[PDB]
RNA sequence: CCGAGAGGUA
DNA sequence: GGGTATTCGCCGTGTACCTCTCGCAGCCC
DNA sequence: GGGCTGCGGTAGCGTGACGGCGAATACCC
């Protein structure tokens, strides 16, 4: 279901901007999880270009130049 | 209530009829003013489950897609096929209903001209590409979505 | 109309034609003088006889209820059915009396 | 920070940290003095509950409180909830170069432009006017230009009509539900104090005129002016994205 | 006959039904409640005497001293209400309580005390109520709103569906005390009975029976009836009363008297019960399989061996019968456990019970209640005997005992406040009966089950909290008391009572700030019934049914005036005629109907009485005798509106206004509006601003008079008589002799309240509406308040409105307004702003209020005086300087006018702490206020002395009269003329005592007012002097304001047209305001059209009278036309007696009618349509209500004639230059570097979450990037961006938001290591 | 009569000990030399049948018992003996 | 310029 | 020993704005 | 005057939301 599916994501900021932050941050902390940003709300949190709209060319460029 | 409100608004409502009317209208105001919270929380859960999915290819390279038929509950045919297969790219090439003809090819967007040539031939159901059958890792390819819808 | 203009002639004639639609609609609605009065809501002449026929029908059903011929749920169902039928007849009376007066 | 007066309105975290440090100093002194077992068990237990109350208050039995019976807000309550950092300061932010007023009709407009008052226009476009005033040569420093627009002389209105001209703004009705509730217009200056909004566009915003209010936002940079003209302009949103039906239907 | 301001402008009153009961005083809830709280009422109920007779006499724990009570009193307030609002003190009274300490010797329960002492001690100050129903708490004027809460007494609630997920109903039963512990009984799906106390853990309920010293056999005696098995000749026969076989299957052979009655297999019918009762069948022989499932009732022991056979509540088997049969117990009592009716719920609960005796029952209850601490005999017994059974901590009140005896069908209604054994047992029995089928549940929305708290009850409960704290303090001091060296203020303390009662009147959920912008809004915030508050439900949780209207609201709560939004139906407003019951319920009037003739006697009912009777409808046609003219009439029996016979009814509704409230019965043509638009219309009608020129609704309901009088905004005359003097400041009324006291010669001096601040920054102002030398009667009005016109109620103004689309400028709900509306200042309202400037005491030195300011010039000090404060009357704009205040570092911290406002300084008040010396303007205003007070007390003395000397002239007409010798020596010695030894010399002595009392009182009040001005005022600790400046902006009307009618037709005024472009009719007059017809078919508020046509007819009569009086005619033709205008049509109540208006009161009436003849269209008995047409035929207007209109632009006719009329349109206080705001770069917050929020803080717009999702929905990646990084948060980004803009380079250097680094430090300040990885 | 611990209110150990001396409850708190050697802790001796723990908890100056769980802590008599310094 | 309480607009 | 099945206890419950008051007393150290 | 601190008392205050879901545990093998 949609709230169990958005809280079970491979990106803990996406699952922490949404409902309960305690459960998700302890799960991510004891798992040692890492957030390869790669979505819209991680980049709205961290303050950069959205990887969808005009910023999709910027993220193509950055993903190409690694 | 077994006794109706026989008076309209041009004639005057008396007291009891207006009080029954206020039952019926207070229920509607309470429903809207409490319904809006669930509507907003539904939009929040939906944009946080979506949140990631970006059109990131041009063809996933598949042949699978759902079978769009017109929907029929048991009364007259409710939503026609031209409402469901308007601007969605077909999965395999639709056979013309006569015999084994290539009526439309297998990767054509069905805009209004194609849908009119579908309605003239009375096409049964179209196997069309759906987003849930898209083979793209981390996103949806450009054909399995469909038409832009405002472009 | 605006949808067929957008499908045939594209975006720019549809934008300028949406504006010209809005301008000519406002201008001739101003020239129309389309008010609303108390006389515009035409009461059906057949409305009072429909209500009296429904009152005679509920009188028959309650006279059966005093003599116990029918059940209570069937009485409630018969009263809601005749008031739904009388409501539809009053709506058809006023709708003829407005749509072709 | 102190409020208006002579006393300091202290935060809740200072109460939590000050309690943990008071208890920790007491526990160090008791382990200096070699108190018996039950004293240092209560002392370490009060420190445990103090730390557990600092981190996530109220997850243990009934939450501590300073004034008056309301519990005080801890670190996890600075993160979680509707008013944490995610939902209140990182996903939604308060925004400069922005304005807000009551809307009204103005049916003379073309549907790519909206009316915008002169007072709001001179307040939202203060840096562009400052650039034009030191670029034409009517103000040497920036203090001279700020005095000029604080006085509102006769020459800054031509400057304002020369910063408006091809610069879109984002109008926004306050319950934005879908993407047609943020649309970009070109301003036309209004003698008045009310945003004049083209009527057809109202059916997109769900905006009647019974007391509604809208916010204006200014695209500062150049890529944002081009995004307002090329993606978010009101001429570009004539079909609803939910279907194929036109959203600029005459109401 | 009429009073003299009734003959000024008598409103044409439609309305056919004769009213029998006039409208009660609309503020009687607040006033009767608080008059109950403070009143010297012997026999103790209710009031402060109940509090003192509960808490006193205090005796300590055998300390041989017992402080007792005598009497209490409230002294004068030291500050009258006006100077109390000005200065900021509470409007309170000191509570002088006499206390009598008597102190005993050793061994004196009966012995005489060794010493007494007694004094009038001082505890607290209680805030008195102003005469209009308001408090003045700290300068501001607040209102306590009456709560609506669940009554004390038992409630049988069901919760039928949601629990158990199996469709099995439960049945709980809550005994709600007024004060104390809550006791609930509840079933569980295993059909076992459970008790819980105060929503704690769940105990099986019969343990509370085992706590009341009941053994198991007594409990089984209570909840079960016995079936008797007699050991007999064979197989242990049965006594069988045939009632017990009702509806069960015959398991065995039913035979007796040598005759087979009922065989095995068929169910036992009631005919078989009749056969067994006719055949007299009691004793029948049973098989052994019948007793093999039954349960024993009492205990039995084997007699010879001396041990137990079976315990009570034990099921029986065959070997158990072999045990008990051989012992010698011949009678066997079994429990009849009927599966249909008489269920075995108590017995199975006894099987669940882990306890056996009373002591273990109390130990288990004590382990439930206060867990952990070791249960003891004394501790558990004291706990359970003070849970419900002591007068201290558990008290069902009189309301609770009435509901408790009424829900159990007891006979009595008065009893003791505590419970007993029998009460708990009766609640359990009624709950079991409801489970069995007989009796039913109660609903919670039923207003017979829903009490009202009011001001006196809530303040009395808080005062009782303060008194039990002060009695615990008195018990503290007395056992430590040494005698005789203390007198009763070392024991008692005025601090906790004052602290508690100011806690309630200051910071509570119901003592709230008064909506004061309107006489309607004052009088409908005082009549408010809130479901919220302490002990009630909350806004964000519940619910659906408590937000909904229940059929007991008819005549108690308004159905349609409830605020839309988050709290709908929690903030109900009280009806027009609804009083409050003695117990606090809502009782409404009805007319007692003994037989066919409906009697004019009234009789009040509540909802637990309205159900039993049959109550008629307000408008049912009855002619000349009270007989219902039909043989059948619509009534309502038990909340069900149904049609009943002519002669069955017991009550009738009193009047047809009585369903709705005083907000929504001012709406004419209410019965034609929809319910939704009547709700929006009443809720906006509360919000109207008072215009500068008040203007008399042409289409009113006649309830304007009662609202404008009963809300105390007009200066209603106390004693009638003749006007002696009228000024805009004061009105001096000479009193007629019949209403005038023998001593205290006396003339009434009404001080009017001129231009001052309301609570919503509007202007409350009173203007005299009586001339000089004009008769007024008692109860008549003298000064018109805000939004009043000759004693009526004028919220908005009446304007000529056309219904048509006009070139799109009134598109959705907008409103297009001529220039004649804005030229006449006929909405130009007056707002007043208070602005404070405070000289606080800071380090390095205080802050001066000097004139000299660093870094100003002549343009600052040109408006500021010798002392620095602005002059009175100086027109200021934004960015000006009002009070010069400097801070030595020296930095400018002067008071400056806020951005965007203008105005005129109407008043400057200066408050100074006693000890800080005075700048010279403080002495100027001090001497001005001093001379003003000396002048006004001299005016009181001189004008009252003029009235006293006029009475001396009136008495000296006879009795040795000396006419010429009267005025030879002056007016002081008229007592020493010739007069005999009679009561006229007594009356001269009376007036001499009056004047000498006036001399002494004038001197002492003059000197005391000198002291009360000259002293320093109580300020905050840290502030030295506070200068308050009162601006008064005058806001006109402009594109963007909000106007609305009374029907729910909202509008934002869009274009302010010139006069020429307006749609003019062929007579030449432009129309004033154009509305839009498209709102009317959808929003089904058709009442605004009938208001439009009837207002058109009203101004048609006004134009006709204006022609007959301008083109001036002798008064015969005017009185003939006025008589035709007041007769007009059907059978009405008004007619007029017009030929008794002395040939001048016709003319003054016709002077006050030339702006339009005012028409009362009452609420549900209003004007019919044929009377609107007939009144439009009396005026020379077209009958359809519609005139052909030309266009001002093109000069050519609008096709299809349009509607023009007069609608009463209001200006709501949502003005556009309080909403307009913009921010480029202002101040920034501190914890997260984002802009501030609001308008008073110069802050920017919250670009919230759904706007971010809307920008993600487009491709706006760069717009969003500057929307959350540069414009909002990143400090390096925004300073580089401001410099990049002003260089001419639109380019952002983004960086990282600061609030995300705040997030990193708050997450990292846990045990969490969050980082930022590789480049 | 078994020994319990009481945490008193801060800076009210004198008043708490005064009220518990007016009751029949033994108090014990070491004075260091004059401030107490321990903080607001205090040792009481009573019996829960003679004077109940709720009456002890509702005494002027007593904040709470050292509980650790449901029931208040019994401190052993070797500890109370070894506070005889 | 942070929190709480009350009220209101859409 | 583990399989149902009940109970407990944590999650969540719309957006934007406007106005107002009120925000430590006790205090024995 | 002051540090600090969670109530003020020789107890009991609490009491009008509702659902979903997952772990903890009870009852019955
Ligand atoms: Mg609206
Ligand atoms: Zn695909």
Curated annotation (Swiss-Prot), chain D:
Binding site for Mg(2+): 208, 210, 212
Cysteine disulfide partners in this protein: none
Post-translational modification: Acetylated on several lysine residues in the presence of glucose.
Use in biotech settings: Co-administration of salinamide and rifampicin or salinamide and myxopyronin suppresses the emergence of resistance to both antibiotics.
Role description: DNA-dependent RNA polymerase (RNAP) catalyzes the transcription of DNA into RNA using the four ribonucleoside triphosphates as substrates. Resistance to the antibiotics salinamide A, salinamide B, rifampicin, streptolydigin, CBR703, myxopyronin, and lipiarmycin can result from mutations in this protein.
Subunit-structure text: The RNAP catalytic core consists of 2 alpha, 1 beta, 1 beta' and 1 omega subunit. When a sigma factor is associated with the core the holoenzyme is formed, which can initiate transcription. The rRNA transcription and antitermination complex (rrnTAC) consists of RNAP, NusA, NusB, NusE (rpsJ), NusG, SubB, ribosomal protein S4, DNA and precursor rRNA; S4 is more flexible than other subunits.
Family listed: Belongs to the RNA polymerase beta' chain family.
Identification of the protein by name: DNA-directed RNA polymerase subunit beta'
Organism: Escherichia coli (strain K12)
Protein encoded by which gene: rpoC
Shown segment, full-protein numbering: 253 to 503 of 1407
Curated annotation (Swiss-Prot), chain E:
Applied use: Co-administration of salinamide and rifampicin or salinamide and myxopyronin suppresses the emergence of resistance to both antibiotics.
Annotated effect of mutating residue 664 to E: Resistant to antibiotics salinamide A and B
Keywords associated with the record: Acetylation, Antibiotic resistance, DNA-directed RNA polymerase, Nucleotidyltransferase, Transcription, Transferase
Catalytic activity: RNA(n) + a ribonucleoside 5'-triphosphate = RNA(n+1) + diphosphate
EC number: 2.7.7.6
Modified residues (N6-acetyllysine): 999, 1177
An example Gene Ontology biological process: bacterial-type flagellum-dependent cell motility
Coiled-coil regions, chain positions: none
Pfam families (alphabetical): RNA_pol_Rpb2_1, RNA_pol_Rpb2_2, RNA_pol_Rpb2_3, RNA_pol_Rpb2_45, RNA_pol_Rpb2_6, RNA_pol_Rpb2_7
Post-translational modification: Acetylated on several lysine residues in the presence of glucose.
Protein family per UniProt: Belongs to the RNA polymerase beta chain family.
Name of the molecule in the record: DNA-directed RNA polymerase subunit beta
Organism of origin: Escherichia coli (strain K12)
Curated annotation (Swiss-Prot), chain F:
Gene Ontology, cellular component aspect: cytosol
Molecular-function GO term, any one: regulatory RNA binding
Key words of the record: DNA-binding, Transcription, Transcription antitermination, Transcription regulation
Coiled-coil stretches noted in the UniProt entry, renumbered to this chain: none
Deletion phenotype: Inactivation results in increased initial adhesion and biofilm formation.
Single Gene Ontology BP annotation: transcription antitermination
Function: Enhances distal genes transcription elongation in a specialized subset of operons that encode extracytoplasmic components. RfaH is recruited into a multi-component RNA polymerase complex by the ops element, which is a short conserved DNA sequence located downstream of the main promoter of these operons. Once bound, RfaH suppresses pausing and inhibits Rho-dependent and intrinsic termination at a subset of sites. Termination signals are bypassed, which allows complete synthesis of long RNA chains.
UniProt domain comment: The N-terminal domain contains a vast hydrophobic cavity that is buried by the C-terminal domain. This cavity may bind the RNAP and become unmasked only upon binding to the nontemplate DNA strand.
Family under the similarity heading: Belongs to the RfaH family.
Quaternary structure annotation from Swiss-Prot or TrEMBL: Interacts with both the nontemplate DNA and the RNA polymerase (RNAP). Monomer in solution.
Annotated protein name in UniProt: Transcription antitermination protein RfaH
């Amino acid at each position: 279901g949609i709230t169990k599916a958005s809280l079970a994501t491979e990106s803990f900021i996406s699952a922490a901007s949404f409902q309960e932050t305690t459960r998700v941050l302890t799960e991510a902390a004891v798992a040692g999880k890492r957030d390869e940003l790669r979505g819209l709300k991680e980049n709205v949190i961290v303050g950069r270009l959205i990887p969808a709209g005009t910023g999709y060319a910027y993220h193509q460029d950055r993903m190409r130049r690694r | 209530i077994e006794t109706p409100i026989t008076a309209n608004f041009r004639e005057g409502l008396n007291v009891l009829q207006y009080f029954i009317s206020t039952h019926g209208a207070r229920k509607g105001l309470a429903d809207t003013a409490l319904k809006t919270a669930n509507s907003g929380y539904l939009t929040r859960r939906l944009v946080d489950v979506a949140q990631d999915l970006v059109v990131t290819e041009d063809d996933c390279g598949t042949h699978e897609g759902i079978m769009m038929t017109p929907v029929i509950e048991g009364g007259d045919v409710k939503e026609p096929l031209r409402d469901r297969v308007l601007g969605r790219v077909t999965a395999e090439d639709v056979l013309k209903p006569g015999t084994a003809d290539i009526l439309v090819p297998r990767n054509t967007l069905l805009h209004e001209q194609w849908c009119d040539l579908l309605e003239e031939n009375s096409v049964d159901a179209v196997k069309v590409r759906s987003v849930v059958s898209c083979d793209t890792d981390f996103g949806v390819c450009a054909h399995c979505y469909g038409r832009d819808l405002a472009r | 109309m605006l949808n067929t203009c957008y499908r045939i002639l594209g975006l720019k004639p549809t934008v300028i034609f949406a504006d010209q639609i809005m301008y000519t609609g406002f201008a001739y609605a101003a020239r129309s003088g389309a008010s609303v009065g108390i006389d515009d809501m035409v009461i059906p002449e057949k409305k009072h006889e429909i209500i009296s026929e429904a009152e005679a029908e509920v009188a028959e059903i309650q006279e059966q209820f005093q003599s116990g011929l029918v059940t209570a749920g069937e009485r409630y169902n018969k009263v809601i059915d005749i008031w739904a039928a009388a409501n539809d007849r009053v709506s058809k009376a006023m709708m003829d009396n407005l749509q072709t007066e | 920070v102190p409020l208006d007066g002579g006393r300091f309105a202290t935060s809740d975290l200072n109460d939590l940290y000050r309690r943990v440090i008071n208890r920790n100093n007491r526990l160090k002194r008791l382990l200096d003095l070699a108190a018996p077992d039950i004293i240092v068990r209560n002392e370490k237990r009060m420190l445990q509950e103090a730390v557990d109350a600092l981190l996530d208050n109220g997850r243990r039995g009934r939450a501590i409180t300073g004034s008056n019976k309301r519990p005080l807000k801890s670190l996890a309550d600075m993160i979680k909830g509707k008013q944490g950092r995610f939902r209140q300061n990182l996903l939604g932010k308060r925004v400069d170069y922005s304005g807000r007023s009551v809307i009204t009709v103005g049916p003379y407009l073309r549907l790519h432009q909206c009316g915008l008052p002169k007072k709001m226009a001179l307040e939202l476009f203060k840096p562009f006017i400052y650039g034009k005033l030191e670029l034409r040569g009517l103000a040497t420093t920036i203090k001279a230009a700020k005095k000029m627009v604080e006085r509102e002389e006769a020459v800054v209105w031509d400057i304002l009509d020369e910063v408006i001209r091809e610069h879109p703004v984002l109008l926004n009705r306050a319950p934005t539900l879908h993407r047609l509730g943020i649309q970009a217009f070109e301003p036309v200056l209004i003698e008045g104090k009310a945003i004049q909004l083209h009527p057809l566009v109202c059916a997109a915003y769900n905006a009647d005129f019974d007391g509604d209010q809208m916010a204006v936002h200014v695209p500062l940079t150049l890529e944002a002016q081009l995004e307002a003209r090329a993606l978010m302009m009101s001429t570009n949103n004539i079909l609803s994205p939910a279907n194929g039906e036109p959203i600029i239907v005459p109401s | 006959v009429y009073s003299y301001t009734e003959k000024k402008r008598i409103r044409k009153d439609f309305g056919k039904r004769p009213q029998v009961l006039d409208v009660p005083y609309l503020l009687s809830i607040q006033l009767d409640s608080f008059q109950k709280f403070i009143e010297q009422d012997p026999e103790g109920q209710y009031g402060l005497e109940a509090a003192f007779r509960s808490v006193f006499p205090i005796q300590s724990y055998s300390g041989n001293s017992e402080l007792q009570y005598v009497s209490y009193r409230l002294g004068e307030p030291v500050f009258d209400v006006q100077e109390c609002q000005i200065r900021g003190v509470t409007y309170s009274a000191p509570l002088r309580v006499k206390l009598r300490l008597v102190i005993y010797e050793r061994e004196a329960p009966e012995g005489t005390v060794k010493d007494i002492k007694e004094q009038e001690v001082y505890m607290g100050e209680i805030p008195l109520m102003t005469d209009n129903g308001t408090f003045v708490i700290n300068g501001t004027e607040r209102v306590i709103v009456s709560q609506l809460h669940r009554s004390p007494g038992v409630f049988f609630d069901s919760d039928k569906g949601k629990t158990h997920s199996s469709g099995k109903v439960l049945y709980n039963a809550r005994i709600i005390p007024y004060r104390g512990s809550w006791l609930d009984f509840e079933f569980d799906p295993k059909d076992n009975l459970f008790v819980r106390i105060d929503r704690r853990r769940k105990l099986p309920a019969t343990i509370i029976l085992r706590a009341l010293n009941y053994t198991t056999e007594q409990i089984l005696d209570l909840f079960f009836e016995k079936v008797i098995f007699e050991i007999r000749d064979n197989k242990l026969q049965m006594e069988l009363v045939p009632e017990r076989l009702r509806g069960e299957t015959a398991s065995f052979d039913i035979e007796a008297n040598g005759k087979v009655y009922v065989e095995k297999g068929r169910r036992i019918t009631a005919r078989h019960i009749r056969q067994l009762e006719k055949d007299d069948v009691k004793l029948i022989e049973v098989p052994v399989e019948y007793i093999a499932g039954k349960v024993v009732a009492k205990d039995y022991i084997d007699e010879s061996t001396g041990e137990l056979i079976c315990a009570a509540n034990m099921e029986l088997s065959l070997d158990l019968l072999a045990k008990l049969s051989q012992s010698g117990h011949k009678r066997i009592e079994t429990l009849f456990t009927n599966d249909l009716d008489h269920g075995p719920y108590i017995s199975e609960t006894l099987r669940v019970d882990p306890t056996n005796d009373r002591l273990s029952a109390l130990v288990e209850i004590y382990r439930m209640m206060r867990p952990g601490e070791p249960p003891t005999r004394e501790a558990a017994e004291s706990l359970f005997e003070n849970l419900f059974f002591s007068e201290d901590r558990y008290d069902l009140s009189a309301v609770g005992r009435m509901k408790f005896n009424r829900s159990l069908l007891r006979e009595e209604i008065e009893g003791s406040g505590i419970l007993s054994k029998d009460d708990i047992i009766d609640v359990m029995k009624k709950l079991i009966d409801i489970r069995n089928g007989k009796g039913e549940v109660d609903d919670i929305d039923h207003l017979g089950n829903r009490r009202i708290r009011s001001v006196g009850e809530m303040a009395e409960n808080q005062f009782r909290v303060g008194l039990v704290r002060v009695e615990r303090a008195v018990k503290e001091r007395l056992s430590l008391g040494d005698l005789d060296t203390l007198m009763p203020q070392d024991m008692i303390n005025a601090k906790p009572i004052s602290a508690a009662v100011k806690e309630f009147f200051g910071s509570s959920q119901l003592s709230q700030f008064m909506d004061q912008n309107n006489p309607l809004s004052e009088i409908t915030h005082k009549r408010r019934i809130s479901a919220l508050g302490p002990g009630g439900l909350t806004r964000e949780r519940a619910g659906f049914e408590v937000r909904d209207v229940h059929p007991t609201h008819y005549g108690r709560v308004c159905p349609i005036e409830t605020p839309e939004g988050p709290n709908i139906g929690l903030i109900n407003s009280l009806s027009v005629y609804a009083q409050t019951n003695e117990y606090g319920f809502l009782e409404t009037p009805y007319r007692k109907v003994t037989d066919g003739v409906v009697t004019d006697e009234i009789h009040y009912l509540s909802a637990i009485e309205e159900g039993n009777y049959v109550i008629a409808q307000a408008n049912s046609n009855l002619d000349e005798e009270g007989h219902f003219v039909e043989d059948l009439v619509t009534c309502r029996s038990k909340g069900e509106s149904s049609l009943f016979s002519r002669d069955q009814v017991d009550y009738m509704d009193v009047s047809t206004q009585q369903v709705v409230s005083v907000g929504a019965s001012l709406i004419p043509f209410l019965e034609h509006d929809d319910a939704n638009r009547a709700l929006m219309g009443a809720n906006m009608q509360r919000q109207a601003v008072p215009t500068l020129r008040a203007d008399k609704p042409l289409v009113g309901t006649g309830m304007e008079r009662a609202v404008a009088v009963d809300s105390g905004v007009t200066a209603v005359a106390k004693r009638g008589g003749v006007v002696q003097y009228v000024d805009a400041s004061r009105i001096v009324i000479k009193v007629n002799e019949d209403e005038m006291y023998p001593g205290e010669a006396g003339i009434d001096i009404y001080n009017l309240t001129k231009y001052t601040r309301s609570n919503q920054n509007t202007c409350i102002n009173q203007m005299p509406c009586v001339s000089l030398g004009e008769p007024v009667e008692r109860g008549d009005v003298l000064a018109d308040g805000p939004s009043t016109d000759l004693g009526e109620l004028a919220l908005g103004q009446n304007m000529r409105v056309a219904f048509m689309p006009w070139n799109g400028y009134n598109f959705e709900d907008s409103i297009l307004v001529s220039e004649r509306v804005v030229q006449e200042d006929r909405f130009t309202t007056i707002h007043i702003q208070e602005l404070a400037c405070v000289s606080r005491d800071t380090k390095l030195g205080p802050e001066e209020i000097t004139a000299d300011i660093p870094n100003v010039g002549e343009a600052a000090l040109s408006k500021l005086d010798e002392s620095g404060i602005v002059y009175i009357g100086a027109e200021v704009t934004g960015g000006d300087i009002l009070v010069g205040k400097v801070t030595p570092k020296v930095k400018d911290s002067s008071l400056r006018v806020p951005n965007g406002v203008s105005g005129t300084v109407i008043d400057v008040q200066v408050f100074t702490r006693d000890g800080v010396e005075k700048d010279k303007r403080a002495l100027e205003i001090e001497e001005m206020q001093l001379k003003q007070a000396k002048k006004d007390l001299s005016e009181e003395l001189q004008i009252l002395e003029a009235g006293l000397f006029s009475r001396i002239r009136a008495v000296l007409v006879a009795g040795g009269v000396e006419a010429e010798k009267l005025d030879k020596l002056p007016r002081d010695r008229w007592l020493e003329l010739g007069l005999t030894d009679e009561e006229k010399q007594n009356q001269l002595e009376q007036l001499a005592e009056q004047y000498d009392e006036l001399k002494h009182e004038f001197e002492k009040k003059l000197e005391a007012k000198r002291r009360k001005i000259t002293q320093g005022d109580d300020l905050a600790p840290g502030v030295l002097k506070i200068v308050k400046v009162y601006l008064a902006v005058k806001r006109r009307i402009q594109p963007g304001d909000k106007m609305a009618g009374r029907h729910g037709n909202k509008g934002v005024i869009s274009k302010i047209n010139p006069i020429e472009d307006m749609p003019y009719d062929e007579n030449g007059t432009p129309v004033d305001i154009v509305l839009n017809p498209l709102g009317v078919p959808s929003r089904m508020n058709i009442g605004q059209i009938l208001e439009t046509h009837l207002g058109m007819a009203a101004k048609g009569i006004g134009d006709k009278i204006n022609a007959m009086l301008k083109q001036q005619q002798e008064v015969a033709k005017l009185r003939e036309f006025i008589q035709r205008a007041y007769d007009l049509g059907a059978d009405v109540r008004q007619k007029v007696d017009l030929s008794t208006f002395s040939d001048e009161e016709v003319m003054r009436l016709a002077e006050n009618l030339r702006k339009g003849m005012p028409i009362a269209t009452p609420v549900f008995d209003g004007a019919k349509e044929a009377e609107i047409k007939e009144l439009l035929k009396l005026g020379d207007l077209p009958t359809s209500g519609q005139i052909r209109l030309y266009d001002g632009r093109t000069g050519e006719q609008f096709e299809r004639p349009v509607t023009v009329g007069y609608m009463y349109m209001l200006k709501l206080n949502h003005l556009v230059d309080d909403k307009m705001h913009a921010r480029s770069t202002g101040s920034y917050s501190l914890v997260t570097q984002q802009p501030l929020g609001g308008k008073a803080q110069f802050g920017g717009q919250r670009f919230g979450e759904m706007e971010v999702w809307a920008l993600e929905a487009y491709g706006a990646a760069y717009t969003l990037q500057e929307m959350l990084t540069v414009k909002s948060d990143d400090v390096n980004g925004r300073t580089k961006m401001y410099k990049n803009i002003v260089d001419g380079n639109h380019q952002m250097e983004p960086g990282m938001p600061e609030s995300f680094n705040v997030l990193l430090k708050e997450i990292r300040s846990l045990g969490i290591n969050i980082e930022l990885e590789d480049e | 009569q078994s020994w319990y611990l009481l945490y008193c209110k801060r800076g009210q150990l004198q008043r708490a000990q005064e009220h518990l001396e007016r009751q029949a409850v033994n108090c014990l708190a070491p004075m260091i030399t004059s401030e107490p050697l321990f903080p607001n802790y205090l040792f009481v001796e009573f019996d829960p049948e003679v004077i109940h723990t709720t009456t002890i908890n509702a005494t002027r100056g007593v904040s709470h018992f050292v509980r650790f769980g449901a029931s208040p802590a019994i401190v052993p008599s070797a500890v109370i003996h070894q506070l005889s310094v």
